[PDB]
Amino acid sequence: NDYMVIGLARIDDRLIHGQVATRWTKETNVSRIIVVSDEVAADTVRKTLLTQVAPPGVTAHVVDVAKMIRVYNNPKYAGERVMLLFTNPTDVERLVEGGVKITSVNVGGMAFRQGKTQVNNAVSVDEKDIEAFKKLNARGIELEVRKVSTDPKLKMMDLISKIDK
């Protein structure tokens, strides 16, 4: 808690898409953005493009889940407000297990796919994504689903409750 401060945790398989990162950066008052994904971290070409389109005044970083736990374990970012970008709620539960503190998780968007169920206009969940959301809720963590801060906030459990019992 006396270390970095998670300004917001946005889940999105697209990371930066449209003005969602620009508007969310100014509204969230975020000057730093860290991407946690082993698949992207292994793509040097994609990392270059994301780093070259990093919004002005905002820095974008690319690290893996194991490396991310260590960056947070460094008080060098204490007080610093950083935004966490994830592609799947599974990677979020992993950070929590490492002793990372998360009060709430925001679902930005998830590419739909066959075998998955559509819960929102562009949010899909599989039996694995749902299982991770249930564990976060059981820990008292709030789960909100919303594409833009200007859109009505919905509860992840409510959307999954009207689908999965």
Add this chain to the structure above:
Amino acid sequence: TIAIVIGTEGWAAEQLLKTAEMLLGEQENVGWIDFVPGENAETLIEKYNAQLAKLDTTKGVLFLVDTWGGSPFNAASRIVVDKEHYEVIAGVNIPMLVETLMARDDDPSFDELVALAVETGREGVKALKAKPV
């Protein structure tokens, strides 16, 4: 907020707004008009006026049009002529619309919004090209 009216030849204005709202959510204080073959600038002036009657124009009005010199542009030009806080900007594109709509909520001054719309519209035009590896 500052009022925004979008006008293009044809029926594209409504879709540019729809596209923006797909990105940002539904917008307030925004109007649009279409221009069909057979209509002239005078028809368009009436259309713009009917849209303005429904908008809050107290802080100003920004007409975003497709191209410099077309009828939509010419008609909008006749309306803003000796009006304070009225401007017409040609070359409307999604980057311009999105940035402009986002900034509008933070209550910028009229000159600030006009400058941002031109700058973001131009900076939004960019080719991918080969990328470094």
Add this chain to the structure above:
Amino acid sequence: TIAIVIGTEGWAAEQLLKTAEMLLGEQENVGWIDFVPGENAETLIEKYNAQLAKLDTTKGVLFLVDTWGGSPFNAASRIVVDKEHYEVIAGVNIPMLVETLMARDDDPSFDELVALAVETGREGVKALKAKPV
């Protein structure tokens, strides 16, 4: 001629083309796609490919998209990656479309067309402002 494919979030691409054709007459060798909530880049890649199958891509393909970084842009980026004479240009607007379609008929080289599209797109964004008297 060089093939042009237009892609934007929502349903604006078809209208931008319609607007252009209202100015220039019906166009050949032009395709477009829409992007609906629920779709992903992979869906869009298929849509782009289906459009390309119907186009003459021998001289090259220019994807004109709404904004840098959106799904339409991301999917187009994956297609042009190691292809010669394939490019993606964000910020599509009417001045860019009109100038590009006009020049295309005079059979310019691919690099020439790409450069013209970016330049006309940017120069097309212009505010009226006060005029000299």
